[PDB]
Each structure stands twice: as C-alpha cells, then as structure tokens.
C-alpha cells in the first residue's frame, strides 16, 4: 500500500494543567478534540481562536461567567476578571468547529488554568452548561462514545438526561466504559481537577 | 528570448534580528518566504500585514500567547504586553497568503525581535504550533524541501510526525539536506537563536 497516511488518535496519559479532553461529532464518525487554555497577566480579555463558530464562543462566555460568580468555591484568584487575559485555543487550525456540547470541557479547562491545578486527561467529557451551572442534554451520544472507546478512554462524564440514549450502544463498548452521570458542573469540577496545585499562580 | 520574466528565489546568509526563513506550497511548486517582525515602543498591539488570511492571523496570536507565558526562559522583557507594539509583515504585499503551517517561523521571528538575538537565516523551517508548545504536523513536505534544496539551504527543521514523508524525496536531495526533527518549540528556539544580543533593548 505504501506510506501510512493517517494517524490514529490516542488518549493522553498524564494530567496537564490547562487542558481538557472533549468529544466531537463529524460526518465520518466521532473524534477527540482537545481544548487548551492559557492564562497570562493582562487586563481582562478573552481571545477565542481555532476557527470557532458563534455558539461555541457563547458557551465559553457562559462558562466564564459561572466561574466569575463562584470565585471562592474552587480556589480561583480573587480578581481575575481585571488582571488576567485568557486565551482559548482548540487545535487544529484550518478546520472549522461549532456547537455547544463543549460547555463543561471549556469550564474544566478554564478553571484548571486559573487555579494551577491539573486536569485528569483520561476522562472524556461532553455536555452543555448554563449560567446557573446546570448541565443540559446533548446530541450524538452514540458516535462520541464509540470513538472514545476506539481510542482507549475508559471513563466518561455525561449529562444525566442522556441515559435514555445509553441503550443504543453496542454491548461491547458499553461494557468497556464507566459512565458518570452528572447534572451540575460542580460535580464535574470536583471529579476532574486534581486536589493539589503545582504551578505558581498567575498574579 | 529577451528580458527574463521570473526572478528566482535567493537565500540570505547573515544572521538577522527579527527575521526567519519559511517555506510555502503553491500548486506550481514550493517557495521560500520570509517573516519580518518589528518591535517598537508602544502600548501592546499586534498589526499583521501582507494580505494574511484568518488561520495565519490566529497562528500569530497562538505563538505570541505561548511567548507571553514563558517570558524568562528566553530572556524576553517581563512586560512587553503593555509596552511594545509588534508588527508582523510577510512580503510581498500584493499576494494573498493563508494556512497555519508557519507557526514555528513566527515564533522564532517574534522571539528574535523581542529578545534582540539574531536568528540564523540558513535554516528553513516549518510547522504548526499550539498554545502549550506542542508542534503539530503539516502537509506538502516534498515540494517545500525540494524548493529549499535548489535555493541553497541545506538545513531543515521539521515536525517529528512528518518523519514518515521523507521517503518521497529523491536520494540525492535527502543526502544533501540535514533534517532536524522536533516536538517542542523550545528545541527550535535553542537551535535557531544565537546567544548574545546585538541591539539595545526596546523598553
Ligand atoms: B456538540 O454540540 O455535539 C459538539 C460541539 C463541539 C465539539 C468539540 C469541540 C467543540 C465543540 N458538536 C460537534 O461535534 C460539532 C458538529 C455539530 C455542531 C453543532 C450541532 C451538531 C453538530 N463538531 C464539529 O463541528 C467538528 C467536527 N469535526 C472536527 C471539528 N469540529
Ligand atoms: B502552510 O499553511 O502550508 C503555508 C504557510 C505560509 C508559508 C509561507 C508564507 C506564508 C505562509 N501556506 C501555504 O503553503 C499556502 C498554501 C496552503 C494554504 C492552506 C493550507 C495548505 C497550504 N500558500 C501560500 O500562502 C502562498 C504560497 N505562495 C505564494 C503566496 N502564498
């Protein structure tokens, strides 16, 4: 056949600070999308790069407002709204992405970047977040969970209103996975972030 | 035949502050391109001229956010987000350019311009950058390495994941070149930037 012309996507292992593992629906199956966030000193801004649509940008702003409202439940700095520039980048560039099922993935990445606590990278997430912190049901559960099982991820966070859709999965992938059902984003942040900080916090 | 129609590409020799050599792909063939960055006193702005597309404009901001995050690894001034203005120019002005494959070139040019250390100009380079330093593979490798050989450049910097496309090259070209394979951009910045700045610092 010749030179191998595709690279199979594969799970990461160690916990990263500022990074979270999301799941995406494409018309040729599901894929793993990785969301990464940096928090540098600045004046309070929000760059959103990676060819993102408008629904995804609005979901990132909703996640940031939820974290601005609860700045001492998670150990965030006291005034990051005024001293810290945030940059959300979803690689790769030159591939357009859209949709809101990425709300809790961006919430996890942003809260990991602001308070220097790593995020576990062997748990794939999906779900839509609101401004009170409610996790709302999403679409395309079957393809996303299939492609997460193909790539060696064995733990999922998923909205609680999607357990009706866990009957159309194949039995082989449903025995492989450990589904956690949530209905509130504080459970997600308590389960994903490692308890102890590593980096120096950005002033 | 008369007056020559097409001026050929030429490689520079001397190290220069603020420039870096990049490769590009056209459907006719490869091309050399040069990135230029100026860092003058100002208030923190980012002009991007030369008919750049959106993906290339986002590559520039991802590279700059990376460098704002690691500001004492490379001897950058500790507050350049407030005090300098950057301007990235890609000659020539009339031809539209697009795509994210030139992130490693822009990161080298920006770090050279900010840290006052000249970058080596006998090394062509290419590669997509992400927000935490990981290089991402690119496409169209043989046209670019072919065009860099017949312009007189015998050192390439290439992503690690593009090692598999090096068997498309002819044998004499591959014996001519000296490929260096990278994963992080710290490796690229150590290989390209000379020590010991040769300009007074912008402050
Ligand atoms: B979610 O709404 O089901 C999800 C949003 C998402 C995924 C990953 C990263 C950021 C956001 N949507 C998708 O999977 C979308 C397609 C879509 C969007 C809205 C409604 C229905 C379907 N995925 C993409 O657009 C995509 C696909 N492949 C690569 C990159 N992006
Ligand atoms: B990269 O995306 O492959 C590369 C980035 C680049 C290189 C050199 C100078 C500026 C930018 N771009 C290209 O190779 C593109 C073609 C392309 C675009 C999108 C995806 C893949 C490839 N070509 C140009 O920008 C170009 C080439 N020659 C003259 C003018 N522009």
Residue B101 lies in a domain: yes
Contact of B67 with B188, CB cutoff 8 Å: no
Query: Cα-atom radius of gyration of chain A, to the nearest Å?
Result: 17
Nearest CA to A62 among A105, A119, A32, A124?
A105
The one-character DSSP state at B167 is G
Tell whether the torsion through CA atoms of B70, B72, B78 and B80 is positive or negative: negative
Is any ligand 2 atom within 6 A of the Cβ of residue B67? Answer: no
> A122 is in which domain, residue-wise?
19-192
Distance CA A77, CA A56 (A): 25
How remote is the CA of residue B26 from the centroid of ligand 2, in Å? 7
| Resolution for the entry shown, Å | 2.4
Distance CA B126, CA B105 (A): 6
In the sheet with B84-89, reading across from the earlier edge strand, the strands are B45-49, B84-89, B30-41, B19-25, B124-125, B156-159, B179-182
Contact of B121 with B13, CB cutoff 8 Å: yes
Distance CA B160, CA B174 (A): 16
Is any ligand 2 atom within 6 A of the Cβ of residue B31? Answer: yes
Instruction: Give the domain CATH number at A100.
Output: 3.30.230.10
Domain count, chain A: 1
Residue B199 lies in a domain: no
Residues shown for chain B: 203
Chain B positions in Cβ-Cβ contact with residue A42 (cut-off 8 Å):
81
Nearest CA to B62 among B112, B138, B128?
B128
The SS3 call for residue B8 is: coil
Residue A4 lies in a domain: no
Q: Method of determination?
A: cryo-EM
Provide the b/e sequence for A23-57 (b: ≥16 CB within 10 Å): bbbeeeebbbbbbbbbbbbbeeeeebbbbbeeebe
* A23 assigned binding-site residue: yes
B144 belongs to the catalytic site: yes
Kindly report the three-state secondary structure assignment for every residue of A24-82. EEEECEEEEEEEEEEEEECCCEEEEECCECHHHHHHHHHHHHHHHHCCCCCCCCCCCCC
Residue B174 lies in a domain: yes
| Integer CA distances (angstroms), A70 to A66, A100, A193, A198, B53, in order | 7, 22, 16, 22, 39
Residue A125 lies in a domain: yes
Chain A positions in Cβ-Cβ contact with residue B83 (cut-off 8 Å):
none
């Amino acid at each position: 056949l010749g030179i191998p012309r595709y690279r199979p996507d594969k799970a990461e292992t160690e916990p990263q600070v500022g990074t979270a593992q999301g799941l995406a629906w494409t018309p040729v199956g599901g894929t793993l999308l990785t969301i990464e966030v940096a928090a540098v000193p600045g004046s309070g801004k929000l760059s959103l790069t990676g060819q993102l649509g408008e629904v995804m940008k609005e979901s990132a702003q909703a996640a940031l407002t939820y974290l601005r409202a609860h700045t001492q439940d998670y150990g965030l700095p006291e005034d990051f709204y005024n001293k810290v520039d945030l940059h959300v980048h979803v690689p790769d560039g030159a591939t357009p992405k859209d949709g809101p099922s990425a709300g809790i993935t961006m919430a996890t990445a942003i809260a990991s970047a602001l308070s220097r606590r790593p995020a576990r990278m062997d748990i794939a997430m999906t779900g839509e977040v609101s401004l009170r912190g409610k996790v709302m049901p999403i679409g395309g559960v079957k393809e996303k969970l299939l492609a997460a099982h193909q790539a060696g991820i064995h733990k999922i966070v998923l909205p609680k209103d999607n357990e009706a859709q866990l009957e159309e999965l194949p039995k082989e992938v449903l025995e492989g996975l450990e589904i956690k059902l949530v209905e509130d984003v504080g459970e997600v942040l308590e389960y994903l972030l490692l308890p102890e900080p590593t980096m120096p916090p950005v002033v």
